[PDB]
């Protein structure tokens, strides 16, 4: 049967290779009745445009995996919040791509979440490996 995978990306010109990218992996999987097909929707930087294009297109496509991209603005976090909101009650599996914030990391809400990129919060653990070797026994702290 035809298998569709959800995706949330903008710049359909860039998404053209994504149709081919999944096509390259289409012949790789050993499934006999599952055939992955690209199913992506335009990322509109506003919640109103997506207020009428969720149930009609996304869920109706029987998509099992969802990919969420980032907005063109480097400093923004309002793009991936509704995608995980509509895929949590139906519990549709999702897979993040540009996961830089820590909103979906407390496990209180939207438990089904995958991060292919560590958020900003993970930089503290790897920070040990520099302070301890480079002396600096006594350290001050500043935070916003």
């Amino acid at each position: 049967k035809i298998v569709n995978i959800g995706a949330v990306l903008s710049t359909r010109k860039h998404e053209q290779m994504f149709r081919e990218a999944v096509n390259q992996a289409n012949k790789r999987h050993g499934s006999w009745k599952i055939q992955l097909n690209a199913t992506s929707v335009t990322h509109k930087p506003n919640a109103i445009q997506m207020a009428l294009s969720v149930c009609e297109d996304l869920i109706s496509s029987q998509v099992y995996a969802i990919l969420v991209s980032h907005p063109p603005t480097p400093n923004d976090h309002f793009t991936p919040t509704p995608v995980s909101y509509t895929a949590g009650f139906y519990r549709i599996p999702v897979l993040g791509l540009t996961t830089r914030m820590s909103i979906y990391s407390d496990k209180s809400i939207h438990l089904s979440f995958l991060r292919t990129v560590p958020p900003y919060s993970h930089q503290s653990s790897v920070w040990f490996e520099m302070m301890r070797v480079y002396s600096w026994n006594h350290i001050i702290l500043l935070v916003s």
Binding site: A47, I48, L52, C55, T86, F89
Partner: protein, 391 residues
């Protein structure tokens, strides 16, 4: 002016409710209460996103009262996005909108019916003293809202003149499969006669199964559950043991038309204070299109002027968490059969138990007398509630 449209979903009789809407004696201020009656089914999210935003754009609608009658686990947060999107005041009355929420956005203003999470820690602590229930334990797992609740209970223990009995804290994992061998052994470590649990009936059906498997509920074990565990009195999976005692929001003593009329009253009386001093009302865009760029007129005044709201002489202040913090709680005990029956009530931060001794050898009786050097009787100290430690 202002206008409020009610959103009634479920099985009820809106004919009687609609009569009380146009019966307010509001001659003090020109509220001009616009009344609209909506009653339909919106279980699927598809209809919600296509009908809700059209209602608020009818004529400058700035008030919504919404209720259900079911126990769905996803009812409340479907409107959290709308509250996050638009500053329209939306209040949850019944149904799935009677839940406690862990974290809310600063722009997602919302009011929910039900006591706060920390308020559930101030009800069972007052009743465990009366019936000599001085020993307790806590079992729970990874849940959205357990981290803050466990901090409050242990905070009140230290600042007291009387010791308290605690027998470990259990946080057994439930997400991992094949956990039967990892729960029965840990359940054996629990030996306190009174054990408190914090779970959810949908996922706690396995909790009673393993608990009743080892059978540590024979004669001296009594289970206390919060409001959300029971969910509904009628909904009984026939798994609880005989004699379960619970505390939950009152529904028998608080009828349907009383709560719905309070929601419209709270919003309407909130705008009266704003016009009392500033004599102005913000006028944002009344449309569900490009609301992000049309939110210039911030409604911060309404959020900061809600604490001084009273109805019928009773304070109903709402904090930033959207809770009244002084609701009516009912002490309700499951009967011999699978029937939930009220026993006590909570009011004026006081407890009025109908009985004195919990219903029924290791529990004997003694009779003593006052003697000079052997048995000394002294009165109870009022500062600590109880009398004194070591007596």
């Amino acid at each position: 002016s202002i206008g409020i449209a009610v959103i009634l979903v479920g099985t009820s009789d809106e004919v009687a409710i609609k009569d009380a809407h146009e019966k307010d004696d509001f001659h003090h201020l020109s509220v001009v209460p616009r009344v609209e009656l909506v009653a339909m089914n919106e279980t699927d999210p598809k209809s919600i996103i296509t009908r809700i935003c059209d209602l608020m754009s009818d004529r400058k609608i700035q008030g919504v009262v919404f209720a259900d009658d079911t126990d769905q686990e996803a009812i409340a947060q479907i409107l959290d996005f709308i509250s996050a999107q638009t500053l329209t005041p939306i209040l949850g009355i019944h149904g799935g909108s009677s839940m406690i929420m862990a974290d809310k956005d600063e722009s997602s203003m919302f009011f929910q019916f039900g006591p706060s999470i920390e308020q559930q820690a101030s009800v069972m602590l007052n009743i465990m003293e009366e019936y000599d229930w001085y020993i307790f334990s806590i079992v729970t797992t990874y849940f959205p809202g357990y981290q803050d609740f466990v901090n409050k209970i242990r905070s009140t223990i230290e600042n007291s003149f009387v010791g308290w009995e605690l027998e470990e804290v259990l946080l057994l994992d439930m997400s991992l499969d094949d956990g039967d061998s990892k729960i029965q052994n840990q359940l054996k470590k629990l030996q306190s006669p009174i054990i408190l649990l914090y779970c959810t009936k949908e996922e706690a059906t396995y909790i009673f199964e393993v608990a009743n498997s080892v059978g540590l509920t024979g004669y001296g074990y009594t289970w206390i559950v919060p409001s959300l565990v029971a969910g509904d009195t009628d909904t009984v999976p026939a798994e609880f043991p005989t004699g379960l005692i619970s505390v939950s929001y009152d529904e028998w003593d608080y009828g349907l038309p009383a709560r719905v009329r309070d929601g419209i009253a709270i919003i309407t009386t909130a705008a009266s204070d704003m016009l009392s001093e500033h004599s102005f009302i913000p006028e944002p865009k009344s449309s569900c299109y490009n609301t992000h760029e049309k939110r210039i007129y911030q409604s911060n005044m309404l959020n900061r002027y809600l604490i001084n709201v009273t109805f019928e002489g009773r304070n109903l202040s709402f904090s930033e968490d959207g809770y009244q913090m002084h609701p009516k709680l009912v002490i309700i005990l499951l009967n011999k059969e699978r029937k939930w029956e009220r026993v006590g009530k909570w009011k004026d931060k006081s407890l009025q138990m109908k009985y004195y001794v919990w219903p029924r050898d290791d529990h004997l009786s003694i009779v003593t007398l006052e003697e000079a050097p052997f048995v000394i009787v002294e009165s109870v100290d009022p500062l600590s509630g109880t009398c004194m430690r070591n007596t």
